[PDB]
Amino acid sequence: SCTCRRAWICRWGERHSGKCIDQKGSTYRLCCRR
């Protein structure tokens, strides 16, 4: 929930917390970078 991205993976050890309102999360789960 800190990096609106669309991919099966994320930056690195990111934590999911929901998507944002810019690209519309059609399915790709967002990811947060602590």
What is the experimental method?
NMR
Q: What is the DSSP letter of 15?
A: B
d(CA 10, CA 2): 11
Q: What six digits make up the tokens of 21? A: 């309102």
Strands (E), the chain: none
d(CA 18, CA 22): 13
Residue 25 CB-density burial (10 A; 0-12 exposed, 13-18 middle, 19+ buried): middle
